[PDB]
Amino acid sequence: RFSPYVFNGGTILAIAGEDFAIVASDTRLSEGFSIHTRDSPKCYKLTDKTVIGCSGFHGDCLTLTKIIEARLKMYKHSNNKAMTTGAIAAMLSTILYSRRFFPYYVYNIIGGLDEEGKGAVYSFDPVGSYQRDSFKAGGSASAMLQPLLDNQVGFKNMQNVEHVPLSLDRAMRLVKDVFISAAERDVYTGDALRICIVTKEGIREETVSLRKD
Amino acid sequence: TTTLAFKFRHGVIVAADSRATAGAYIASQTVKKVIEINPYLLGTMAGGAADCSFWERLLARQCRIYELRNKERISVAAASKLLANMVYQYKGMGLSMGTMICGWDKRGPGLYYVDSEGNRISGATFSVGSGSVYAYGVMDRGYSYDLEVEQAYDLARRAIYQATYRDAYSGGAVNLYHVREDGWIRVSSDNVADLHEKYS
């Protein structure tokens, strides 16, 4: 038994704001007990309005993102407009299901703006189950990240707190904290955090150092 | 997952929990498990999430083409059979889908259970999913064809609630729908935490 899969690690995260989206990932690429490289981000630019995060089996991450790139140009050629964030998510669902009986071993989170200019996150399973979310963690350390987000962004289990809108600064401070906390415990998550911020002005990039052990 | 539906004098009630899991990990508490096939037909989702979404979205595609070709609403019987014939070709390949097709047509209120094993049956009441056994218990003890509308909404909602209590793999919120003669409506979304407050 040759196995066509191997786990290469990676943690991804997206947050939807009122007028922004964040997509964040660590930069470590692993195999077994080893590090392949410390500088392999998992975020990919799709359009001026849409970014995708991918982790899992790296062979599939590469193949799937190249397929998505080709499908975006084909769409643009047939229809004379860029694919919307929502249309990309709907398409990705069908691409993932096309391999239902030999899946892309990939966890995908799309972050971008929708047609009204608002933050949009869509999260996927490997065979294309998806929905829209306010925020979502995925990949290696998702079980470490998600609960704190449920608590701090969703205001869950909290009494007597005003459910205020999520500012970019606070969203940003959260993204850094959950990854730093994940880096303490998940052996796959480390090296550096890469953050993409999608706004009407475009896509900008912050990077924060994580533990190298 | 817990889902249920039943026919009664005033149409068909359809209810579901909202939980999704990957093993014991709770993946979501906000999943829409009732799918709007057209304005007078709902489909419900239990099993593999991608499998249900894909095949019911494909059912919807097919029902719409039918309507454009034939110049009339597809029947609940014909829609449920399109789904059965689609999935049959894939038996033993690992699809996991348990669905109810709920509508109102020329034969009145309609309700079919359809699944990846090949079953397609019509009936008065059904519950589907890991929690179904818990929902059958309360649903069966409260059901009657001559339920008043609000009593029927309370029964559906309680049956799902009770399933969420016993079954680890059901929870989130109960989402309730009503197929009437002039189309379905969305009647309520209640978080299970808020329902617990109420039922004691």
Binding site: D125, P126, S129 | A20
Partner: peptide
Amino acid sequence: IITX
């Protein structure tokens, strides 16, 4: 992957 995920189940309902």
